Amino acid sequence: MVEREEAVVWDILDEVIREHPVLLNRAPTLHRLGIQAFEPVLIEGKAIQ
Amino acid sequence: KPLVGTGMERAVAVDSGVTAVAKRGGVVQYVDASRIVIKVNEDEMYPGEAGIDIYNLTKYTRSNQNTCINQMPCVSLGEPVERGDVLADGPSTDLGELAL
Amino acid sequence: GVLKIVKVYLAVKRRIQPGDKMAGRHGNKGVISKINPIEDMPYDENGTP
Amino acid sequence: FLKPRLVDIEQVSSTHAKVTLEPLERGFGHTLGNALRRILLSSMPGCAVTEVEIDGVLHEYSTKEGVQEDILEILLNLKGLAVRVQGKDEVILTLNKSGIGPVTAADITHDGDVEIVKPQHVICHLTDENASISMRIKVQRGRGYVPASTRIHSEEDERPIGRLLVDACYSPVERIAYNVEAARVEQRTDLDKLVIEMETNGTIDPEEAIRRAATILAEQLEAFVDL
Amino acid sequence: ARVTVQDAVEKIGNRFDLVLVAARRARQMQVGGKDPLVPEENDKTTVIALREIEEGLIN
């Protein structure tokens, strides 16, 4: 299904990302609050806005 | 071309091997995208082996960092050259000027 | 051993994409950012934006 | 209120012109100014090289005996062809050339639908005496910026392996910028005027240009009206 | 979508055993158990559990 870019998975993609408490972690952090969390959104780009 | 330089710009483009130069100037004759054949003028010719200078071009080939060296022809057919004259300059060069 | 060998080359046309490192011969670096329109940039007496 | 309208289109050339709008009210020089500017700057019906089959091609990155650049760079020039069609969805432009001379945009098989605006547009050169080139430039019409890279994943089942897939840049426009100034009608206190300086290589007539754009806005407002 | 779940943090202060509760709860909404009462809207069951804590009906 993902192999065919099915319009099906696109709607399902919306459902599992629009509300995913994710961990934006930077490995080299020498501080606790350098590892925080956000909420991913379907964005047309090539980087993390 | 860069609107500013130092005077070593032609020292790069023209003298880096990136261009099919000529050791014995002459009327360009059989120029192709592979090899360039030059009919040598006798005022700058050594009587040895008649007079047919052979040259090889770096016309799009491979390079270390997955690159692809690119040669850009700068001289049109039908004109004599000189000892130190160019035929087709390499990458990022125009008629003999370094435009990194 | 090396008797039935093969040598094949593959070439790809590559154009600059957001995230490429452009700079200068002086010392200032830089990376191409978000692709911008053509004339939304301030132009001048010459005409080129 | 006097209805918005464009006066005689200031035509300096067939390729580029500048529309003039007299009956513009408070803020329309900017309203329509950008409401057209953006669409005019991207989505426009153009004709661009899709697939081309040249004869002397082992691979598109080859040095054909007689040409200055790559076979693909021959296609690089073909990428911005100033061809104008009348109705075909897709069309094949045959390019045959043998003899000492620059292969210009005149030695191409001149079809009735194929109307090149600039005949002297040199693609590549054929400088060798006894050499030859022969290809078929399959150009179609679309809109926007669509690359064969985003289209390369399929191969389209190619038996005639000479069908190299190249970049379809469908953008006839290049320079769209609007200016404003005091417009004076006979019945009104103050009106604005609009001067959209649009540039087209020679595929779509300036009026047909502003025609298509305005029409697409109409359709993109179709659904937008229902609450 | 949720911007602040500080409310959940206050209904059940453990913030750890809280995760074990919804843990077994997600299990019920998957492996047999019982159906999710609140009619879900795109939100995975993990977030559905988050909402049930804010209401404080299942802990």
Swiss-Prot record, chain A:
Belongs to the RNA polymerase beta' chain family. The RNAP catalytic core consists of 2 alpha, 1 beta, 1 beta' and 1 omega subunit. When a sigma factor is associated with the core the holoenzyme is formed, which can initiate transcription. DNA-dependent RNA polymerase catalyzes the transcription of DNA into RNA using the four ribonucleoside triphosphates as substrates. This is DNA-directed RNA polymerase subunit beta'. The gene is rpoC. The chain holds residues 400 to 448 of 1407 of the full protein.
Swiss-Prot record, chain C:
Coiled coil: none annotated. It comes from the Bacteria. Belongs to the RNA polymerase beta chain family. DNA-dependent RNA polymerase catalyzes the transcription of DNA into RNA using the four ribonucleoside triphosphates as substrates. The RNAP catalytic core consists of 2 alpha, 1 beta, 1 beta' and 1 omega subunit. When a sigma factor is associated with the core the holoenzyme is formed, which can initiate transcription. This is DNA-directed RNA polymerase subunit beta. It comes from Escherichia coli O45:K1 (strain S88 / ExPEC). The gene is rpoB. The chain holds residues 1045 to 1093 of 1342 of the full protein.
From Swiss-Prot, chain D:
It is an enzyme of class 2 (transferase). Keywords: DNA-directed RNA polymerase, Nucleotidyltransferase, Transcription, Transferase. Residues 1-227 are annotated as: Alpha N-terminal domain (alpha-NTD). Its EC number is 2.7.7.6. It catalyses: RNA(n) + a ribonucleoside 5'-triphosphate = RNA(n+1) + diphosphate. GO terms for molecular function: DNA binding; DNA-directed RNA polymerase activity; protein dimerization activity. GO terms for biological process: DNA-templated transcription. It comes from the Bacteria. GO terms for cellular component: cytoplasm; DNA-directed RNA polymerase complex. The keyword Transcription applies. The N-terminal domain is essential for RNAP assembly and basal transcription, whereas the C-terminal domain is involved in interaction with transcriptional regulators and with upstream promoter elements. DNA-dependent RNA polymerase catalyzes the transcription of DNA into RNA using the four ribonucleoside triphosphates as substrates. Belongs to the RNA polymerase alpha chain family. Homodimer. The RNAP catalytic core consists of 2 alpha, 1 beta, 1 beta' and 1 omega subunit. When a sigma factor is associated with the core the holoenzyme is formed, which can initiate transcription. This is DNA-directed RNA polymerase subunit alpha. It comes from Escherichia coli O157:H7. The lineage of its organism: Bacteria, Pseudomonadati, Pseudomonadota, Gammaproteobacteria, Enterobacterales. The gene is rpoA. The chain holds residues 8 to 234 of 329 of the full protein.
Curated annotation (Swiss-Prot), chain E:
The gene is rpoZ. Keywords: DNA-directed RNA polymerase, Nucleotidyltransferase, Transcription, Transferase. The keyword Transcription applies. One of its GO terms (molecular function) is DNA-directed RNA polymerase activity. The keyword RNA-binding does not apply. It is an enzyme of class 2 (transferase). Its EC number is 2.7.7.6. Belongs to the RNA polymerase subunit omega family. The RNAP catalytic core consists of 2 alpha, 1 beta, 1 beta' and 1 omega subunit. When a sigma factor is associated with the core the holoenzyme is formed, which can initiate transcription. This is DNA-directed RNA polymerase subunit omega.
